[PDB]
Amino acid sequence: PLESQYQVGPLLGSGGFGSVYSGIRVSDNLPVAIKHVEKDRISDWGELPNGTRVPMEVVLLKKVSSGFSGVIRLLDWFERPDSFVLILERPEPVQDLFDFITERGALQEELARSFFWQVLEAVRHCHNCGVLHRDIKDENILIDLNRGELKLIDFGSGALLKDTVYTDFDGTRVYSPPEWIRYHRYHGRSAAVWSLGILLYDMVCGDIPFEHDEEIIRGQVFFRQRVSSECQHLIRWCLALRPSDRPTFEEIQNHPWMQDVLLPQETAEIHLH
Numbered sequence: 062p063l064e065s066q067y068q069v070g071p072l073l074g075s076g077g078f079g080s081v082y083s084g085i086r087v088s089d090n091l092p093v094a095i096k097h098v099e100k101d102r103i104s105d106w107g108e109l110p111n112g113t114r115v116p117m118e119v120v121l122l123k124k125v126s127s128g129f130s131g132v133i134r135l136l137d138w139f140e141r142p143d144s145f146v147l148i149l150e151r152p153e154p155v156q157d158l159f160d161f162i163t164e165r166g167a168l169q170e171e172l173a174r175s176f177f178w179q180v181l182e183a184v185r186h187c188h189n190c191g192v193l194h195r196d197i198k199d200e201n202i203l204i205d206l207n208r209g210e211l212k213l214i215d216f217g218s219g220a221l222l223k224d225t226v227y228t229d230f231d232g233t234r235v236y237s238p239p240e241w242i243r244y245h246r247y248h249g250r251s252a253a254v255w256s257l258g259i260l261l262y263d264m265v266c267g268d269i270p271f272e273h274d275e276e277i278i279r280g281q282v283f284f285r286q287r288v289s290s291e292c293q294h295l296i297r298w299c300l301a302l303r304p305s306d307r308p309t310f311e312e313i314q315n316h317p318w319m320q321d322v323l324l325p326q327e328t329a330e331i332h333l334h
């Protein structure tokens with residue numbers, strides 16, 4: 062009976078996918094988040110190691126929720142008659158990247174370097190666990206304002222990592238690569254690197270580079286803010302039209318702009334405190 066184990070708080074964010082509320086674990090007052098998703102709106106179903114029909118989001122969360130704090134962890138879950146309920150970790154104090162960018166404007170490169178580096182570690186952690194996020198963007202990134210650590214949220218559009226082609230996509234369109242727009246085909250890792258380049262541009266420019274499909278297909282990047290030559294190169298490299306022309310994760314983290322990253326605690330002391 063979850064209605065007793067947890068105390069439901071206010072509403073953190075809502076959409077057609079479902080609804081997530083703030084919560085507190087009654088036992089130890091652990092701050093949590095309570096996500097509800099109706100079975101009717103579930104398109105991706107998966108199998109649990111014990112052979113249980115469960116939303117794919119639960120499968121993915123289980124596979125990444127061990128040890129590493131780069132992604133928000135699944136603490137527990139329940140099945141209700143018409144819905145599932147997910148109990149998720151919740152940092153305090155916290156704020157998502159989109160509200161942070163909106164509040165502070167384009168980030169300084171030193172700060173953007175630390176943030177982008179942390180999401181690369183989180184996405185790299187997911188892939189190591191056989192999980193593709195497929196909706197990497199500022200709204201899906203959480204900032205622990207005290208520790209300076211970033212965490213990934215919303216695996217509702219994810220899937221199992223595979224090396225063959227994906228023919229479906231339910232993430233954010235303006236973050237989707239040109240091969241999805243044109244051919245409805247893409248490969249996980251190279252598609253992720255594309256969204257990563259959008260994320261980086263959004264970090265240092267305060268806005269997304271493309272809005273329409275024709276802009277995504279063209280792939281020409283104009284900078285509305287002063288951005289170093291190193292960073293512009295990394296961004297345009299991630300945003301290469303040809304997927305095979307995009308960098309690997311190792312190449313992104315070996316890029317010259319990616320050097321001498323600040324530690325998360327150092328990041329918060331300089332930029333967050």
Ligand SMILES: Cn1ncc(NC(=O)c2nc(-c3c(F)cccc3F)sc2N)c1N1CCC[C@H](N)CC1
Pocket residue numbers: 073074075078081093094096133149150151152155156157200201203214215216217
């Ligand atoms: C779709 N979906 N699925 C899971 C989640 N959110 C979490 O899991 C989650 N959010 C947390 C949170 C927050 F987001 C904002 C402020 C304070 C918080 F504590 S704490 C935690 N575990 C989401 N959100 C929907 C809510 C709004 C998001 N910007 C977009 C995706």
